[PDB]
Every structure is written in structure tokens, then in C-alpha cells.
């Protein structure tokens, strides 16, 4: 199966963070050592870069920041003062909108001057997708737990609606307007063909992938996470789409599983996510530092249990708990969103970590295979469980 | 244009080093910080790993070693004692041949035990190529300086002959024999489909690309490097194929240029390359640490000279001289093999470095473009020049 | 006594290297870990940056390069590819002269783009001197070995001549021309007062200091280094001025001593210095990592020999031998230039290091103090000795 | 079997280097990353510390220096300036003898002041030996190749003579004189019992071990290394005793083998060893980073050849070649001294490395075991071989 690249995952996650349920709004991904240490959105008061500065401080040193829009000079100067390594941005309308003009152009010139005289690398890191990536993402999104749960109890129409909305929000349809934007933000190298068309095609492909994944967990009828108070359905859907996006980083050859841990703080913060802050993220993969042939990839079809992948694969929840950027606070409400039902070795870890709520698909609940089982999730106590289903009331 | 990956380049270079013009012969590539610091071949006395130990010593610390065959236990224990990081090997018949049996199997078990109890990672790092990579390599090999030079004064017949020879040398045609080899060398994870077939297909694709590149500089009629004593035509062809392989790592979007610097020592050496030892290697690329859109990629067609790639591209010879692993010794004969004619900014650098001989294609000699010229190569003095041509004697 | 800063030392040394006795000529200082690892001059064929690339390779990683003129785009791209940290340059007419124009301006724009899209920091690092630095340098230059030796057997006339010549060579007298140069090389921040006048005044002060030091070892009458073949008097004077510039970095509170070790290669080199290459440099100082009050600074006047600085001061020749960037080759001629007579502690070290020649001051020869003596220099065997004096023939 | 400590190995090697066949003479061991990178002796002109400074320069950074006597202030200041990490010394009469005295005491005070104000750690690092270490060393020294070779064609008499001589040279028999020395060199903490007696007993035990090892290669009758010109018998015996001392660092459970590679330079150097300089050293051990139970330790008695130590043990010559601090110069004469006969996997490595001469014991010549053989040493060509034997002429 095709795999999403790291920089493309971070770009997609920043674009999705810009859409978090609440000068243009900006989403931001803070990555350290190829691990996500922050997910931020602009608020009505502060920009995403200012929020990242407040939240991290000097911990931004040697960090990679993926913005959904080019940050303003006020944000960029503080970000490079904090000592970040890379600032990747989505080459659309920047934070100070250029589609509104003299102040925005002056801000863009100031950003260029800051970039020219800093060790931080301000750039565009989005890469082309493989030709099969979008088709594979669509195939797996139609076969995901939530779409199938809806089907048993439409998806293409929701996908088309999300395509239109996200193309409006994230792309510049007019080619001359986009050329002007790229000239203003110091991307003149991508203003002439084939680089201009290639950049626009890559952006359109990433937007199509994002719309596909977002439609995999759709706002459809009365479908949401139900069955200790649940989150608003919009935030739950957004976090589940984060997990679904992470599921496409899978090292597994058959099934990708993603997990995101968020927490709800007691006091209101400066972030555009409100009291909620990102805690951890993960996908199913082999132990870090493993080659392609280091560990078996065979499924249960293998006639030898020793050469089955199950005893060596790190699960999405296990990876989210391992590489968490925050501590699970016992007083705070904490949520883990996982694309598949948690297994019998993940549920005890989630419970022991103190995670209060599990939002999950329940397609595999109650299944007992030779190597992996799902009996503990159904009988789990002390952790609220929310599954995709019709609103029972 | 498609780009060869680093690990695939190193695997191909080790396989090609096994074919250097003079228990099975082994080629070896020693890489440090993603830069080639050694190119070795087994001799009649010493294996490639023992030769690498003699040549480097403690400098093998944190190095990646790419072997054309799985090294024996005697080689592996010393290599891991020296402190290397990775030992990638080509999963054909190992150094101690398993196609000859009890001693070879015991050696394989000892190698596995060494691998299990060492920090060094022994693995197979060859990865699938792009579906267009082989076709693109064939297209550029037919359009290379040497094939065109022969054409003006056949290539596919040589390609087929090299395909047969290199498939015989580097592949195991019998599937059961290859399965036994992989079981013995501790690669049981790749002994069942689709992993077995995928591994064999990747190996066949790499062998096809290697045969294509080797045929791009063919042993055809009386064509060789001519026009202070020249190297034997076999060694010159081998080094030119090394440069051609490096040319496929190009960061440029149109033309890939490769360069290899070798030197001929005075006293006898332990290597299978004889007195000749690898000095440096390079390809045309942008300055290290540059993103895709950091520097212009436009050719001379651009209406603005400021946005042309020529003032920012590092040439193959410049990269070979920058990241050389050895010092150019004034007393020793030193050779640089470059796929294209050296330009007017590369010839002075080659002359100043003290390189005695330039083996090059002369298709572009005498051309004077706006940004790049070739006038200094024809009028160069103090450096022997050898070009692809019929033997003038 | 006032002390020269490291960055001003390197700037002065690069400007002086531009004047090494043999597009504008460029001098270059390569510094690693605040230690000089290279002294280069442009040749007829190659620029200083290209020469540094040939000489060092990837060893330029994390190095600071001090250029007497702003390097061209061809030099800058290679230097950045090599991985240097800082490129300080003297903000006069750059390497591609702007006083000759479209090609030079295009090269300057390319240099600006390379600087803006690289991790390397291209900058002007010259800083103001203390108000007493020039007066103190003049006072010590009149009271140095090479001026007092002539006086016993004029200095201000030579100083005025050097002032005129070096102001003509290194400064841009016309303010509009200098403003145009600074605008072209991307130094617009220094084109407006008081920054323009401050930059010009700092440059004038540095040029005055350089002229003072250069005239402290003057081309006067038939005075030179005499008493196994001697170097040309011009090169000997240039190296002595190098050592004299180093003497102003002294940690001593009374007397500054400088030492430069150069070596003559057997074969032809690409550098503008010819076969001669820089080996090491040093000044008298306390052991590295010592504070102001770590060690005693009292001279022999102290009534206790324990609290005398002599037991703890590292001499200039000892520092030059300690932090040498090259190995002393027994076959090659090697010279050490020391501003004062080498002591009985340094002469055995110089002899043991294999240094063939000592060019030294003659004032302190034969002095025998309680802590430091000079008896071994006169009776030294196996090392050629050249002192400042009238030509005996 | 008991194992010699690293620090005790270095202390013994410094004491033995003080006895290298040519103010008191001082031996010096320079160690980097627990590997010996230099073996030096004081000459008639330069002290061991000054020689180490000349030979290494800034390469002494973070190095551990083991002195046979406490270095003088002139040596210590330069060694600290070079950036060494640790200076261990033998707490006998220091470099400036205190048994001759006001100048010596002043030098000791200056050394103490240098130690107090430097990051370098000046200390006495000799450790007590286990109670069986000396008895085991005596047992293995009587059963070594050279003593047995003499016996087949006395050892305790030579042992007693060496005990007397080395106790005279390295120990201070008078307790009051040693107390005065320790007070003067700032070791007052070890001047009163039991620390004074414990220090003296540890020193006596180390000198007994040194005398034992030295007597195991005795100046007896006309026995020397014979069978392209051989080294003087004194230097050959000294290097063989170095190898014997290294043999006691063995990770093997049965037999310890040591190897030292030295080279003779073409030109005279500053060292007290003359033109000869240390190249490398090694002992038989498992690959670096292995635990006690990582690899099998069984001899040939084990039935399963897979669990035999022979396929995983790194030999003494292999370790000497791996961690060499110098390159083998083809023009220079190079010698390797091995306590045992080189095996069939060591002789090809020695020959390929370009080592001109092998000085070794010949007890095992011609033995062919299942895992280790000695057939190649007898038929070795192109390498001079010198074995312990009565002088044939
Ligand atoms: C339950 C769970 C699993 N994983 C991982 C384990 C596998 O690496 C992959 C699924 O792969 P799997 O075990 O073959 O499951 P399938 O659906 O393909 O099985 P099937 O339909 O044949 O019954 O996700 C995870 O990261 N986090 C979880 N909470
Ligand atoms: C001469 C030379 C060049 N290079 C690089 C520079 C460019 O990055 C690329 C060619 O790129 P180019 O100049 O656009 O292409 P051509 O020349 O084929 O031009 P054409 O005839 O189609 O107009 O190789 C190199 O690494 N080492 C060399 N010695
Ligand atoms: C000989 C010599 C010395 N030095 C240093 C160490 C001295 O500590 C300092 C001068 O310091 P100094 O000795 O108090 O000064 P003077 O001798 O001028 O004293 P004077 O004759 O007026 O009483 O240079 C040096 O780096 N290289 C040398 N080859
Ligand atoms: C020949 C040789 C060996 N070694 C090491 C590896 C062996 O593993 C160990 C002795 O271990 P060994 O082989 O069990 O011992 P012996 O031979 O004494 O056996 P014996 O005749 O009593 O049965 O030295 C070495 O470092 N350098 C050498 N050149
Ligand atoms: Zn902002
Ligand atoms: Zn799980
Ligand atoms: Zn081998
Ligand atoms: Zn070129
Ligand atoms: Zn230049
Ligand atoms: Zn001195
Ligand atoms: Zn000393
Ligand atoms: Zn051996």
C-alpha cells in the first residue's frame, strides 16, 4: 500500500488544523525529531505562530513548523528568535491576506527580509503524491469503520462537497492571482511553467486527499460519537479525521490505524483550539529504527505464528502514548481517538495512562483472532467509550 | 526526471565494484554522512570487508557498508568491531558461497549470531525503483555522450549481453535455490510471497538498470578513451560507468552529470582495485541543505538570467572535489572521470586540485552558451585529456 | 593594554593576505573553532574561495571564512555547499569589481539569492576599535624589534606611504561610489547615516592599524632577514607582519608576541601564495579556558617567583605549534616567524618540531633573566636563523 | 582469569615507556577514547610532555595522558593548553627531581597552581590489583612462548634482578622521602596511614607485575628475535614486553594475546624513541560493545562449532590494525610484535596492511586446529619474520 510522506502528513495536518471548530486563520503543526509536539490554530486574538510561541517558548528550538499560511513578520521574527529549524508553509494566501494591500505587501517584504537574514529555513515542503495515493485513500476511506457503519444503518456526495469547500478555502483558483501571491511572498521560482502548474497540481492533489479523508468521517444525518460528557460532535469529528490522516503513515502492508490523544484543560488558553490541547499521536508501525525486512509483515495467513507481524507491530495507541508531548493530567478530561477498535493490549495501556475517553470505530469489537482480540473494549470500565452510531436520543 | 535513491545507488555501486577489472568476489561501498568514502573489491588474498578494515580502521565508525554479497563471519566480526552503523548486503549468494556446504552454513549461522549480538544493523536495503526509472535510464543511456559518439562514427545488443551476464552473476535464477539461500542467511521473512517475488523483482530491476548503465559505456569495436599514460580501457570504462551511475542522483531537472576521482598509488595495495584507490565522487546538485524551491531550476530559456539555475548549481566535478575522502597527491597519478565535458568553471578547479588526467565525453566541447562554456577544456595544458573515440593508432 | 578582537584580527589578516607578494585579488582567512586553519590569496587562475575549496574540501564544514572582498556567486555556492558557518567580508569593491557592470551586478544579485537561500550566514563582521587601539598599536610599532634595530643602525614616512597605498587599495574614497557598492551587494542597511559614516570610519581605522603594523616591518634601505636558503624578503616581511598582527591578540598585560609557521611545498600549488602554505599561528596567552584572575600576570618585579606569570604563560611559538592546522613535513622547508627572539623554552620545541628556519627579532638575543632566557637561540644548531639587519652582502 | 585494568595498563605502559632503550626520564601514554594513540619517552632534549605536544598538537584535546613522573610546569601548562582531559601520574619522584631543590619545589608549586586553575584533572589513578593478579601474571609469564622457548633449548633469577632494578628506579624505598615528595607534589591526602601504606603497596604490586612481564622476555644468553634488517634486540624486547602487557587486558577466558605495531621513520624525530613511533596496539577480545554473555567463550572442547568462541573473537593483530593511530607508510619499515604466532586469518591482514616485519613467538607454528590454524606464517612471503631463538650467528 502507498504511504503518506512525513512532510505531506504535516502539511495536511496544518491545513486540517486551520479547519478546527472554533488576517486569515492559520493552522500549525509543531514537529520535533519527526514527531508532532504541537497542533495549533489561530484564534480571534492571537495568530498560530504567537500561540505556538506562548505554548512552547524556547522548546521551539530546532523544531519544524508547518503553517497552513505564510506567517506574518510579527510571527516569523518571534518564531526564528525561538530558534526553530524549518518553517514550511502552504503557498496560498498568506496570514496577512494579499487578496484584500500596501500593508500586506509590506508585511510580505518584511517576512522575506527576515528569512534572508536568519538561520531558519522558510520554505514550501509539500511534495507530489504517488499516482495511486489518492485512489488508495478513497478506497480505504470508503472501507473505513465510520463509512461502513453508516452504510449498514452518500459518501461521494459528501466528498464532492468537501472538495468544493476545501478548494475554495485552500486553493487560489485564478492563476494570475496565485502568480501575484507567489511573487509577493518571494516564490518567484514557482511562478513560471512547468513549476507553477506542478505546484498547483500538487496543491490540488493534497486538497483532494484532505477532502477524501475529511469525508471519511462525515457530518451525515444524526451520525456521531455516542454511548463523562462527550465532546461536541464537530471537535470529535475533527480529531477522528486527524487520526485517519495519521493512519496513512502506516508501516503495515494491509491496514493503517491512527490515534490522536487530546486533553481538555481546566482554564481557557490562548490557542484557537480552546481549552483543548494536543497530547500525542501515533500510527501502527514497527519499532523505531527497523528496516523493511527487519520484522515479519505476514498476517494471520502465515502457517507459523513466529513469523506473524502481530508480536512485533507497535499499535497506534501505543505509539501515541509513547511519543506524547504532554503528560496525562488526572484532573483533566483526556480523549483518545482511534480509527479502529482498540485491541486487548491497547485498552489496558489506555486505562493505565489515565485516558478518560476513547472515541473509536466499533466494527471489530468482540472479535477474537489468534493473535489480536477485542474483548476488553466492550467490557471496559472506568473509561468512557464513544463509538460512531446514530444519536440514540 | 526520476532520481535514483541513495541506498539504491550504493547497492548498484557495490555490485559494480564487484565487477572491477582485476569464496566469491565482493564489491563494497563505504559511506559516511551519506557520502561515499570508499570503493573496494575483493582480491585473491583478502575479502572486501578485510580490505575496508585495513584501509579505514577506526574511521569505519558510524559508517554504512554496502556489500555485493553477505560478508563472512571473519569479515563481519571485524567490521562490527570497527564500529560501523549499517551493513546492507545484496541478498544473492553470500561471500562464502552456499551453491558449492557445511562450512558455508556454519559461517552463515555465525554471521547471524554476530548480527543478533551487535549494535550494527545487518540488513537488505535495496528498495523498488520508480516504474519509469528503468525506461528513463535506458533513454538517457542511449542519449549519453559515448553512445552518441559511437553512433556518429548496436547499443541494445550490448545491453542484452550485459543483461544476461549480470543476471547470471548477481541473481539466482532458480527460486528454490534462492529460497534456500535466504533461509540460510537469516532472511526467512522474504522467503514467502509476495515478499519473495517482490524481492526478486526489485533485484531484477536493479540488475537491468546496472546492465543499461554499463552498456552506456560499451566495449564496442575499438572505442575507448584516447588523445601521461592512459589507464587500461577496462578500468577507464568501469570508472566511467561509476560516474554514469552517479549521474542518476542528479538534483537537476534536465541533465545528470557524474564525476569520480580515482588515484593510482605507487606501492602495492591490499585492495582488489590494485594500486588504484577511490578519491571522490559527485553529481550536479544544488548546495547541500537546499529545498526543492530554494533555488531556480530554469534553464537558459528563462528570460531573466538571475532566475537561471546555472549560477546556483554545483557541478559534478565540484562536488567530487568538495567531498573527497582522500587528498590529491602530487606525485601520484590522479584521474577524474566525468560524463559530460568539463565546463569553464570546472577545468580550472580540476587543474588547481592537481588532477593529472580527465576522462570525459567531448560532445559539448567548444560550445559557448550564455551561462556555461566549454572553451577551456580544449585548450587545457598540464592535464592529460582522454575522450571517447576510436583508437587513433 | 588594549586587545584586538578575534573578528578584527581575521579581517585584518584577510586584507593583509590580499597583499601577499605574488576580477580583483582576494585574501581569505579560514577559521575553525576560533583557530586559523587557512591563509589564502587569489591566484591568476583561481579565486580565494575556489582555492579554499580545493585546499580543504568538506573540512570547511562549520568554518568561518573572512574574505577581503565579497566572493562571487561561483565561489559562494561552492563555499556554501562545503558547509561553512559564516562568511564575513570586507565591504569594499567585491571580487567581481563593480567599479569597472551588468555582469558584476548580476553576480551580486546571484550572491544575494545564494545568501538568502542558504544556512550559511554571509555578513560584514568588522567592528569598531577602542579609541586607544590605534595609538597603542603605533606606540608598540615604533618600539618593536624591527624598528628599533633600524633606529640603532623614517618610520612615520613609511607609515604615511602605507596609509595612502592601503586606503587606495582597500577603501572607497568616493561616498557615492561606496553607497552604490553597498546597495549592489545587499548592504542597504548601512547606506544611511550614521551607519554609513560609522562603517566608513571603522574601515578607515582598520586600514590605519593595518598600515601601522605593515610599516612596523618596513621595506627600508637594505634591511631584511639575514644571517638553508632564505625566503624572498617580501614574503618574509609579509609573514612577519602576520605574526605582528597576531601579537596584538596577546593576553599578556605588557608585551605581545606573535608567531606564524609557514611551509614551502615541493610541488606547485593552486594557491596565490605559491608553494608556501600556512601551517600554524599563535600569540602569547594563558592556557585556553583561563579567566582574567585564573593565573598571575605580574612580571619579574614580583617579590615571589610563584606569583610570576612566566610559569603559566603559553608562548607564541608554543601556541603556533599546538594549534597547527598542518603537519610539519621533514622534506619540506618550514619557517617560523616570531616577533621577539625565541626563548630557551621555545627553541627546543621549534627544533623538535622539525622547523627548518626561524625568522626572529634580534633585540633580546643573549638576555638571561631569572625566569626567561635567550641563550639557546644564539648557539642553536640544525635550524637556519634569520634576523632583521642590514644585508651583509 | 583475572584482567588488568585499563588505567593500570596505561600506568604500567608509561612506566615501561620510561625504560625505552635510548630532570629525570619520563614515559608517557596518550589515550583517546580508551585507545592508546601515543607512546612517548623523554629524550635528552625534550620532555615527554613537550614531545607529546609536538607529535599531537590540538589532537591532545579530551585525551588522557599517563606520565611515569609528574610533569613539570612547562610541560603541564602546554598540555593543559592543548585541551587534555586527564593527567594521571605515577607518584614517585616527579620530572623535576626532588631528590637532588628550591627550583624543584618552586616547579612543584607552579604545577599545583596550574592544576588548581585548569579544567584538566591532574591525579594519581593507579588502582590496587586483585590478590591473584600477580600470581596469575607470574604463572602465564613462565608459560609464555619466549620463556618456554628458552627452557626447551633461570626465569626467576631474571625476575628478581628486574624486581630490584625497577624497585630502585620507580619506587622510593625511604618512607620519609616519599612522604616529602607527596607533600611537595600536592598529595598530602596520601601521606598518612592507611592511605600512605596502601599507595606504597599498590605501587610495589604494579612494579612487581612490571618486573614479571619484563622478565618474561628476558635478556638471557644469546636469545633474541632472528630469521629486512632486524631491530636492535633491546627495542624488540621492549616492544614485545609492551605486547605482553597488553595481553593481560584479554577478554578471552583462557589465553591472552597482545600485539603492538611500531614504525621507523625515515628522518629523526623529537621523541626519545628515536625514529620509531607507535602505530597501534591490541589484544584478543570480542567486538567492542559486547557484554559478558553476548558471545560464546568456549574453546575447541565445545562439541558444537557454532558455540565456539573462535568465530567471534577479534585477534590481537586485528585489533592493533583496527584502532591504529597512524597510517602504515609503504616506504617506512613497520613492525608488529605479537605474543603468539599469527594465525591464518591474521597473517593475510598483516601482509595486506603493508607491515614489513613480524616479531612473534613460534610455539604454535604449524599447528592446525579445527577453527584456528598457523600454516600461513611459515610460508609467508614478502614479510620479514623474527622469532625468539638463540642467535644463529
Ligand atoms: C486493533 C489495533 C490494531 N492496530 C494495528 C495492528 C496491525 O498492524 C494493524 C491491523 O492489521 P491486522 O491486525 O491484520 O487487522 P485486519 O483488520 O487487517 O484483520 P482481519 O480483517 O484479517 O481480521 O493495525 C493498531 O495500530 N491499533 C489497534 N488498536
Ligand atoms: C558542464 C557541466 C555541467 N554540469 C551540470 C550543470 C547543469 O546543472 C547540468 C546541465 O544542464 P544544462 O546545462 O541545462 O544542460 P545541457 O548542457 O545539456 O544543455 P543544452 O545543450 O540542452 O542546452 O549539468 C555538471 O555537473 N558538470 C559539468 N562539468
Ligand atoms: C621569548 C618569548 C616570550 N613570549 C611571551 C612570554 C612572556 O611572558 C611575554 C613577554 O612578557 P615579559 O617577558 O614580561 O616581557 P619582556 O621580555 O619584554 O620584559 P622586559 O625585558 O621589559 O623586562 O611574551 C612569547 O610568546 N614567545 C617568546 N618567544
Ligand atoms: C593466533 C592468535 C590468536 N589470538 C586469540 C584468539 C584465540 O581465541 C585466543 C587464544 O584462545 P585459544 O585459541 O582457545 O587458545 P590456544 O591457542 O592457546 O589453545 P590450546 O592450544 O591450549 O588448545 O587468542 C590472537 O589474538 N591473535 C592471534 N594471532
Ligand atoms: Zn502572525
Ligand atoms: Zn491496538
Ligand atoms: Zn570475508
Ligand atoms: Zn562543470
Ligand atoms: Zn570567486
Ligand atoms: Zn618563547
Ligand atoms: Zn617537562
Ligand atoms: Zn590471530
UniProtKB/Swiss-Prot annotation, chains A, B, C, D:
Placement of sequence motif Nuclear export signal: 198-210
One example of a Gene Ontology biological process annotation: DNA cytosine deamination
Keywords, alphabetical: Cytoplasm, Hydrolase, Metal-binding, Nucleus, Repeat, Zinc
Organs and tissues of expression: Widely expressed. Expressed at high levels in the testis.
CMP/dCMP-type deaminase domain segment(s): 23-102, 234-393
Cofactor requirement: Zn(2+)
Keyword Oxidoreductase on entry: no
Listed EC numbers: 3.5.4.5
Recorded family membership: Belongs to the cytidine and deoxycytidylate deaminase family.
Protein name, entry field: Cytidine and dCMP deaminase domain-containing protein 1
Amino acid at each position: 500500500i502507498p504511504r503518506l510522506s512525513k512532510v505531506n502528513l504535516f502539511t495536511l495536518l496544518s491545513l486540517w488544523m486551520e479547519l478546527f471548530p472554533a488576517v486569515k486563520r492559520t493552522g500549525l503543526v509543531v514537529v520535533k525529531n519527526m514527531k508532532i509536539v504541537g497542533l495549533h490554530c489561530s484564534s480571534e486574538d492571537l495568530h498560530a505562530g504567537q500561540i505556538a510561541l506562548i505554548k512552547h517558548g524556547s522548546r521551539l528550538k530546532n523544531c519544524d513548523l508547518y503553517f497552513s499560511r505564510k506567517p506574518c513578520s510579527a510571527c516569523l521574527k518571534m518564531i526564528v528568535n525561538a530558534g526553530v529549524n524549518r518553517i514550511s508553509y502552504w503557498p496560498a494566501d498568506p496570514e496577512i491576506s494579499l487578496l484584500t494591500s500596501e500593508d500586506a505587501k509590506l508585511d510580505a517584504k518584511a517576512v522575506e527580509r527576515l528569512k534572508s537574514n536568519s538561520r531558519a529555513h522558510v520554505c514550501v515542503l509539500l511534495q507530489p503524491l504517488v499516482c495511486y495515493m489518492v485512489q488508495f485513500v478513497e478506497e480505504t476511506s470508503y472501507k473505513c469503520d465510520f463509512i461502513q457503519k453508516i452504510t449498514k444503518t452518500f459518501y461521494y456526495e459528501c466528498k464532492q462537497e468537501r472538495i468544493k469547500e476545501y478548494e475554495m478555502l485552500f486553493l487560489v483558483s485564478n492563476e494570475e492571482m496565485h502568480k501575484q501571491i507567489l511573487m509577493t511572498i518571494g516564490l518567484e521560482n514557482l511562478c513560471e511553467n512547468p513549476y507553477f502548474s506542478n505546484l498547483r497540481q500538487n496543491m490540488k492533489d493534497l486538497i483532494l486527499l484532505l477532502a477524501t479523508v475529511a469525508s471519511s468521517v462525515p457530518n451525515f444525518k444524526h451520525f456521531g460519537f455516542y454511548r463523562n460528557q462527550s465532546l461536541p460532535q464537530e471537535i470529535a469529528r475533527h480529531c477522528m479525521v486527524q487520526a485517519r490522516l495519521l493512519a496513512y503513515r502506516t508501516e503495515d502492508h494491509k491496514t493503517g490505524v491512527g490515534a490522536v490523544i487530546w486533553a481538555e484543560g481546566k482554564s481557557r488558553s490562548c490557542d484557537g483550539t480552546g481549552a483543548m490541547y494536543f497530547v500525542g499521536c501515533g500510527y501502527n508501525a514497527f519499532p523505531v529504527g527497523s528496516e523493511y525486512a527487519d520484522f515479519p509483515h505476514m498476517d494471520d495467513k502465515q502457517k507459523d505464528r513466529e513469523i506473524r507481524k502481530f508480536r512485533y507491530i507497535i499499535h497506534a495507541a501505543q505509539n501515541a502514548l509513547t511519543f506524547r508531548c504532554q503528560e496525562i493530567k488526572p484532573e483533566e478530561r483526556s480523549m483518545i481517538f482511534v480509527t479502529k477498535c482498540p485491541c486487548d493490549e491497547c485498552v489496558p495501556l489506555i486505562k493505565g495512562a489515565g485516558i478518560k475517553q476513547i472515541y473509536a470505530g466499533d466494527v471489530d469489537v468482540g472479535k477474537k483472532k489468534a493473535d489480536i482480540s477485542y474483548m476488553r473494549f466492550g467490557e471496559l470500565e472506568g473509561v468512557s467509550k464513544f463509538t460512531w452510531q446514530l444519536n440514540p436520543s
